[PDB]
């Protein structure tokens, strides 16, 4: 069991009906380092409810 | 200009001197009440306010 605590409150007035997540891509000299095959997604899992 | 967003500019609030151990009318952050203030041992969580 885990209890979640408030962090921040925003006063923005926008309306939201959709959203998306942003991921980090690793580029290095061990890979081609391009947008075709040099990217690596690493290890990560996120669950949506 | 006022919009659907909540108002965020107004006259600054004034903090009067605290009075202890006497039945006094009080207004803490918009919470109004009539009672006697005393020092309390119980500890709140940081985000909790009352």
Q: What is the oligomeric state here?
A: part of a larger assembly
Radius of gyration of chain A, in Å, reads 18 Å
Q: Count all strands of chain A and give the number.
A: 0
Q: Roughly how much helix do the residues of chain A carry, as a percent range? A: under 10%
* Biggest beta-sheet profile of chain A: none
The chain pair forming the largest interface, with residue counts per chain, is:
A-B, 5 and 6 residues
- What is the distance, rounded to the nearest whole angstrom, between the alpha carbons of the first and last residues of chain A? 16 Å
- Tally the helices of chain A: 0
Outline type of chain A: elongated
Beta-strand proportion of chain A: under 5%
Structural class by SSE content of chain A: little secondary structure
How would you characterize the overall build of this protein?
The structure is cut from a larger assembly and holds 2 copies of chain A. Chain A has 49 residues and is low in regular secondary structure. Chain A has no helices and no strands. The first copy, chain A, is elongated, with a radius of gyration of 18 Å. The A-B interface holds A 5-6, 11-13 and B 3-6, 8, 47.
């Amino acid at each position: 069991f885990s209890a979640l605590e408030p962090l921040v409150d925003l006063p923005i007035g926008i309306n939201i009906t959709r959203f998306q997540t942003l991921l980090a891509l690793h580029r290095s000299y061990l890979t081609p380092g391009d947008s075709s095959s040099g990217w690596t997604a690493g290890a990560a899992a996120y669950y949506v409810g | 200009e006022l919009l659907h967003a909540p108002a965020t500019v107004c006259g600054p609030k004034k903090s009067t001197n605290l009075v202890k151990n006497k039945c006094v009318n009080f207004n803490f952050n918009g919470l109004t009440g009539t009672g006697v203030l005393t020092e309390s041992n119980k500890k709140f969580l940081p985000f909790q306010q009352f």
